[PDB]
Amino acid sequence: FELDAAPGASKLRAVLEKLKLSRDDISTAAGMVKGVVDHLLLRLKCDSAFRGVGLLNTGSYYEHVKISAPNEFDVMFKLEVPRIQLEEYSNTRAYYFVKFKRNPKENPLSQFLEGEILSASKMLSKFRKIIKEEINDIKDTDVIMKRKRGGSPAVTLLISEKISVDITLALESKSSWPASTQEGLRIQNWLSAKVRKQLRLKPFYLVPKHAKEGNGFQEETWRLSFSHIEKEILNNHGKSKTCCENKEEKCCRKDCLKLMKYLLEQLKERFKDKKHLDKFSSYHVKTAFFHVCTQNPQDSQWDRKDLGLCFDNCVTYFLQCLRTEKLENYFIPEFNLFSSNLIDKRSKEFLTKQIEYERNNEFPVFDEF
Ligand SMILES: [Zn+2]
């Protein structure tokens, strides 16, 4: 009587199975999304200022941030900016003003300048104007641009009555990464020092994002973004180069991340009307997950048969971050995602209590709605 996995796997596996089943009907939605995105890119490429715009995840017009919202897509439009000088905003480590190494009108971004600073406000404004005008050239399909909520999901489109596409504009820089990332990406004992060096030769991105305090915000800051690196690591994630390419090396890392995301999504959905959980996002869960991979670098610590314990360990790490109010950005270690300035103690304790209940009760929230 050999078990297929150690106890606790089956319920989690049935959850995973159900989540994938929700993706077996996508090709359609994906199609409409690709059509819209390609149209937009064509129009934006005609503007002198956005002439270099392109898909970040090359050949990928989809990237679901919410494991349980298959009709919600996330795409990033990146634009190379030949030579920027970053200036860190008030030692925040993650937020910067964007300035330029030279002055005249050869970079078509001069129109977005405010003094010497590149205005995220102005650029976003043009981006949105171009997009709205373009989705209006769509005659037999109601593509609606949703109203502003912020800067970095820049634009949300509602296609028909079922599909949404969040479009993020990002500046791309091919300079070496800012000094605040110097001690981050601590993958040396997991994915290797040579991999870390290789990754850090890739460009980095900047997305418009107000850096706000308790008081208010400086409207023209940009936040560092490494979503391309996160994707690369998640899909090439083992110490072994052949991790998950055969039966002997099947690991549960990806499934643990999916389960953490689903847990957070289910709880946020249950409590959405009372904003207790508004400030938590899949990005916190993904960041915590990468730290757990650093803490457990060997593939044998993620054997698929041990899904139950691996997931429990993920939950436990996330709880520890909540209780101690510390979750370091994986690329920028002095940027604390769970500081009291960003998320009130009360919200963290609330989430802690919900997750602890779930974990003590075999995760009934996975089944409830
Ligand atoms: Zn693997």
From Swiss-Prot:
Q: Which domain of life is it from?
A: Eukaryota
Location of motif KKH-loop in this chain is 274-276
Region described as Interaction with collided ribosomes: spans on this chain = 188-229
What outcome is documented for mutating residue 62 to A in this protein?
Strongly reduced tyrosine phosphorylation
* Outcome reported for the amino acid change (mutating residue 101 to A): Strongly decreased interaction with histones H2A and H2B
Result of mutating residue 62 to E? Phosphomimetic mutant; reduced translocation to the nucleus following treatment with etoposide
Could you say which residues are annotated as the site Arginine-anchor?
102
UniProt modified residues of type (Microbial infection) Deamidated asparagine = 57, 236
Binding-site residues, ATP: 60, 72-74, 227-230, 261, 282-286
Q: What is the effect of changing residue 321 to S?
A: Abolished palmitoylation by ZDHHC18, leading to increased DNA-binding and enzyme activity
Which residues take part in binding GTP? 58, 166, 223-230
Tell me the membrane topology, using the record's own terms. Peripheral membrane protein
Function according to Swiss-Prot or TrEMBL: Nucleotidyltransferase that catalyzes the formation of cyclic GMP-AMP (2',3'-cGAMP) from ATP and GTP and plays a key role in innate immunity. Catalysis involves both the formation of a 2',5' phosphodiester linkage at the GpA step and the formation of a 3',5' phosphodiester linkage at the ApG step, producing c[G(2',5')pA(3',5')p].
Q: What is this protein called?
A: Cyclic GMP-AMP synthase
Upper lineage is: Eukaryota, Metazoa, Chordata, Craniata, Vertebrata
* Shown stretch of the complete protein: 157 to 522 of 522
